[PDB]
Amino acid sequence: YVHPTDILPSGWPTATDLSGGAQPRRFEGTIFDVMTRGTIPKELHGTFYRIMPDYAQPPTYYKGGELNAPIDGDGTVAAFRFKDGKVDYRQRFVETDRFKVERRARKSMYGLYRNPYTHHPCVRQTVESTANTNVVMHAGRFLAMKENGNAYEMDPHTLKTLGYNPFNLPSKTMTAHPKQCSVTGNLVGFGYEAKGLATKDVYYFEVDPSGKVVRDLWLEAPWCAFIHDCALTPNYLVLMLWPFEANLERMKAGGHHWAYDYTKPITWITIPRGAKSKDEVKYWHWKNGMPIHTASGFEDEQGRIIIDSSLVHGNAFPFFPPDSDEQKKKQEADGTPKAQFVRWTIDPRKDNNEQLPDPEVILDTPSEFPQIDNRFMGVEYSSAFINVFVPDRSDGNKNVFQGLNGLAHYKRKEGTTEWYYAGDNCLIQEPVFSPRSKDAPEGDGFVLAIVDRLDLNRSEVVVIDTRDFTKAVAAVQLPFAIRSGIHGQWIPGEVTPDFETKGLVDLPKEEHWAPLSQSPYDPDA
Numbered sequence: 424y425v426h427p428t429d430i431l432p433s434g435w436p437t438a439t440d441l442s443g444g445a446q447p448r449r450f451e452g453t454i455f456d457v458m459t460r461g462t463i464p465k466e467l468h469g470t471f472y473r474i475m476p477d478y479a480q481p482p483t484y485y486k487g488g489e490l491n492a493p494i495d496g497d498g499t500v501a502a503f504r505f506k507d508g509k510v511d512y513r514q515r516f517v518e519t520d521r522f523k524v525e526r527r528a529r530k531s532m533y534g535l536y537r538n539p540y541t542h543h544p545c546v547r548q549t550v551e552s553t554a555n556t557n558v559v560m561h562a563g564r565f566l567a568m569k570e571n572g573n574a575y576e577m578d579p580h581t582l583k584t585l586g587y588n589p590f591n592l593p594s595k596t597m598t599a600h601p602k603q604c605s606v607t608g609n610l611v612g613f614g615y616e617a618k619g620l621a622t623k624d625v626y627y628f629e630v631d632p633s634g635k636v637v638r639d640l641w642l643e644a645p646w647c648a649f650i651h652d653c654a655l656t657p658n659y660l661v662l663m664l665w666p667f668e669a670n671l672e673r674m675k676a677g678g679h680h681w682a683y684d685y686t687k688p689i690t691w692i693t694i695p696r697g698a699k700s701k702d703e704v705k706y707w708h709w710k711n712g713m714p715i716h717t718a719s720g721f722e723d724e725q726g727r728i729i730i731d732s733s734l735v736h737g738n739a740f741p742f743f744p745p746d747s748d749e750q751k752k753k754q755e756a757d758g759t760p761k762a763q764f765v766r767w768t769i770d771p772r773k774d775n776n777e778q779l780p781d782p783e784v785i786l787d788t789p790s791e792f793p794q795i796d797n798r799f800m801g802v803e804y805s806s807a808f809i810n811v812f813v814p815d816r817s818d819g820n821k822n823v824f825q826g827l828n829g830l831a832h833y834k835r836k837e838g839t840t841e842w843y844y845a846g847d848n849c850l851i852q853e854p855v856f857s858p859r860s861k862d863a864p865e866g867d868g869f870v871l872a873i874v875d876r877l878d879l880n881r882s883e884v885v886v887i888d889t890r891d892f893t894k895a896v897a898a899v900q901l902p903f904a905i906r907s908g909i910h911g912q913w914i915p916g917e918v919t920p921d922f923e924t925k926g927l928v929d930l931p932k933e934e935h936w937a938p939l940s941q942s943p944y945d946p947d948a
């Protein structure tokens with residue numbers, strides 16, 4: 424059986440997200456009082472903000488959109504607000520310069536990921552960010568982020584776009600991975616390609632709790648590398664260089680911004696916090712591989728930098744292949760690479776010209792999207808909440824982003840791992856943590872994540888109490904599916920302006936439309 428209407432032609436290209444899911448969603452709006460199962464913890468007081476790629480227009484501009492990447496599509500924010508056991512939902516597109524152009528034209532006008540040479544001539548000198556990667560609340564300002572531009576600011580309640588570059592950063596770019604220091608309250612980050620397309624320049628910054636840049640430095644990367652993520656320690660910002668190189672000539676020729684390079688080692692840039700000179704910066708190297716995301720970093724008793732990350736032993740983004748024919752064949756040969764969770768040791772006192780020691784295998788399982796207890800951000804931490812391929816319960820032939828069917832709670836101090844299984848015909852997305860109370864022990868509280876109910880065509884928010892990591896306490900049940908996203912964040916009420924007075928949904932007026940006389944009911948009848 425084939426449905427007769429199903430053979431009617433579509434104009435849409437295949438627009439994947441990171442999961443490999445290819446269904447456009449693109450809805451903007453609200454559900455008041457989202458259906459829940461079980462008991463929503465009363466301790467939840469805040470918003471789960473999630474961001475997703477969801478091409479608003481069919482991306483047909485360049486090569487009919489055949490080379491669209493899962494990381495490409497227009498940023499849409501989903502908000503799940505938890506107040507007094509009740510859940511509200513809002514979804515809205517980031518009103519990026521790109522989004523607004525495409526909507527107004529009813530037409531795709533942008534080409535390849537980070538390639539202005541493949542955009543429509545009229546839009547080449549625009550901010551080309553889809554603001555689709557990560558969110559942050561800092562100094563009462565809510566930001567949607569993507570590494571190829573400054574953030575766009577959004578209202579935390581309506582999700583209305585308010586402007587571009589709220590902190591007025593001098594770089595062309597800002598990381599989608601800044602870290603909120605638990606010591607200073609500073610927004611610590613960077614922007615690479617800080618001076619334009621294929622530039623080696625890196626700008627480091629620290630934005631204080633009052634929204635002022637208090638520390639900065641202009642530096643360079645050893646090559647124009649893909650510096651997606653970083654680690655924050657007491658004394659350092661540690662940049663993590665993926666083995667991809669940008670090439671302006673290739674871009675001009677209508678090739679991809681990035682090419683994977685087997686000859687490049689995993690490289691780290693150590694930046695002393697509040698460094699007075701670029702002379703203080705050191706480059707460290709290991710071997711070829713792709714460490715996608717950090718859990719976090721710290722300094723041990725010996726003063727050594729300790730960073731946990733995912734590690735893929737090859738290209739986790741095969742849609743950005745190598746330049747050379749030889750290297751292309753290597754990618755094909757690698758297939759689905761080995762994927763682990765690993766521990767790095769960078770001793771800042773050692774010779775940085777000497778190759779770093781091999782990382783320690785922490786989990787011999789495909790691992791992605793780690794988060795921590797952010798009360799321990801930029802200090803010694805123990806808890807990691809990791810998006811996992813569940814041992815003996817998962818594929819493993821899948822690309823690292825495409826088989827994530829569980830959660831792991833790792834504790835360094837205890838040396839224990841606990842496992843949550845998403846369900847049969849289910850995927851689960853990045854976990855976020857909310858502490859039981861302000862003074863609760865590290866990693867004691869609630870874990871939230873988006874579950875794709877694949878055979879149901881619905882998305883859910885699972886709620887797990889850390890006292891029993893194997894079991895859900897609650898589910899937030901959407902009537903539909905949303906896109907499989909990238910990052911999300913737990914944002915507490917206390918850091919959100921006007922959380923006490925504003926919901927996700929604007930309340931209707933109190934006053935009745937109808938006069939008293941219009942009632943069917945008479946109290947005398």
Ligand SMILES: O=Cc1ccc(O)cc1
Binds near residue numbers: 494569570651909
């Ligand atoms: O998760 C990886 C990622 C990399 C670059 C992007 O622009 C977005 C996401």
Ligand SMILES: [Fe+2]
Binds near residue numbers: 556600651716910
């Ligand atoms: Fe990321």
